[PDB]
């Protein structure tokens, strides 16, 4: 048993990174526009491309369209890929995100990549990154003082914020979380173990605060991200040969 064991990332391709970018919504949902989400989209495209990913992006897909795209990707062979990345940039609440016209439960999307549903990703990291609100709590600032495999294994769920909370987005620079994630990917993405990198992102985002707000009660509010690992090995994105 080797504590240092890493996923094998020596396939022909790094893999696909999908980005679902949601800026506007069907009017009946009365959801505010997400100005600045395009900065996130571009930032992620740059940083994930630099790590070898084939980045694909889609703007404001309706739920039916999004579900179709996601099904298609879970159906193609990932046999010659190291891993799979899927990013959602949208509104959300509870355990769901919004497509243009309706909410989708996040489990509906991840389920399509479980081992029995997607054989060609078995044993490979399946990474989901979600920038979206997760409820209506606004975090407050405080100060100190050989074997078979489970079909559920090797997922990494990376959320911009802990369960139940608002997540923050700058209208020009993009979201707090995606900015900090991309900064870390840019500097450390090709060397640092990815959960270590996500931990640095937790620290970066935790340092931010709402500096100005039309609602004075929101001034100084906070956000801590949260990632869930079902990974079984160390994960790196060393430059591919």
């Amino acid at each position: 048993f080797d504590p240092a064991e890493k996923y094998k990332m020596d396939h022909r391709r790094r893999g696909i990174a999908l980005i679902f970018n949601h800026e506007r919504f069907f009017w009946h949902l009365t959801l505010p526009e997400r100005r600045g989400t395009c900065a996130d989209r571009d930032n992620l495209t740059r940083r994930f491309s630099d790590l070898g990913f084939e980045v694909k992006c889609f703007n404001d897909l309706k739920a039916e369209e999004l579900l179709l795209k996601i099904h298609e990707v879970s159906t193609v062979s990932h046999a010659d890929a190291d891993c799979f990345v899927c990013v959602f940039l949208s509104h959300g609440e509870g355990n769901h995100i919004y497509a243009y016209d309706a909410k989708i439960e996040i489990q509906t999307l991840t389920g399509l990549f479980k081992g029995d549903k997607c054989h060609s990703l078995v044993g490979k990291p399946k990474i989901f990154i979600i920038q979206a609100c997760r409820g209506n709590q606004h975090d407050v600032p405080v100060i100190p003082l050989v074997y078979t495999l489970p079909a559920g294994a090797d997922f990494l769920m990376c959320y911009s914020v802990a369960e139940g909370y608002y997540s923050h987005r700058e209208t020009v620079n993009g979201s707090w979380y995606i900015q900090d994630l991309c900064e870390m990917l840019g500097k450390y993405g090709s060397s640092l173990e990815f959960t270590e990198l996500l931990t640095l992102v937790n620290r970066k985002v935790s340092q931010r605060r709402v500096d100005f707000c039309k609602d004075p009660s929101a001034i100084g509010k906070k956000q801590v991200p949260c990632f869930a690992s079902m990974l079984t090995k160390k994960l790196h994105f060393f430059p591919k040969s």
Binding site: P32, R34, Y166, S167, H168, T171, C213
Partner: peptide, 4 residues
């Protein structure tokens, strides 16, 4: 800053 806006809320998501």
């Amino acid at each position: 800053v806006e809320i998501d």
